[PDB]
Amino acid sequence: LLPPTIYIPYLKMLQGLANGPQCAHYCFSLLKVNVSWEHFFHSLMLYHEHLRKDLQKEQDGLIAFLQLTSTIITWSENARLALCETPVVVILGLLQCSIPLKAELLKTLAAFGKSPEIAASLWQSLEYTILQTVRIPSGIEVELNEIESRCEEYPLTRAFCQLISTLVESSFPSNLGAGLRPPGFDPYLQFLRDSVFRFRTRARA
């Protein structure tokens, strides 16, 4: 069933079905072997182009698409890399667009992040995706601004935190941000000053 609304509920229903580590595996196979994962990313890619070229129905569909990818990627193993490489590139592109959604893709991206060394593609995406627009003077504040400009809303931040929590778990590239800015991990922690400084003054416990 193709109708956009049926299609989105289908995605949601399957997410529910994906529950066990075991079920999640089947859901992985369902798309991979006997709609394919590729079709799914394609849809996301297409929406991305339409969104940017343009500059509720879509939110329904996209939100569902993400809800599903998230559910499985979380409950999976070596398979995670396979989905990772593939939604990773597309998801990154989607994040660049404004979207309401930003947070959600960040949550999914995080699920994709692997335990090992091959974090690097992800860190580059994140740094590039904060760094790109911002103009950084030689001081600290300008760096904070880069993050603040991009991570405008609450969902954006929570998603960002989940992704960061995952990447920071155990590793990252040397001389990160080289070329564009003063390198290193430090500015990210500064950003948290913006966050947990503020937290005390939340809304909404």
Binding site: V134, R135, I136, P137, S138, G139, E141, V142, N145
Partner: protein, 80 residues
């Protein structure tokens, strides 16, 4: 509030004095374009007017910086 207006005035006036002083030193200037000094001494000017007209064209970066201080323009990129 009278005080408020007075102090702001003193600040802006001071800037013109500085700009005026630099104009003398600057060798890019022509004596006949005395008109600028007449304008400077003559009255208080709009900050944007001071900034756009004077600071940028005469590249007085310091003045521009000070002016933006008074304005209280925060934008880090522009400031940097």
């Amino acid at each position: 509030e009278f005080l408020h207006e007075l102090e702001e005035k003193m600040e802006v006036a001071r800037i013109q004095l500085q700009i005026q002083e630099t104009l003398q030193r600057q060798y890019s200037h022509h004596s006949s374009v005395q008109d600028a000094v007449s304008q400077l001494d003559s009255e208080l000017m709009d900050i944007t007017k001071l900034y756009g007209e004077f600071a940028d064209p005469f590249k007085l970066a310091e003045c521009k910086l000070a002016i933006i201080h008074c304005a209280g323009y925060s934008d880090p990129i522009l400031v940097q």
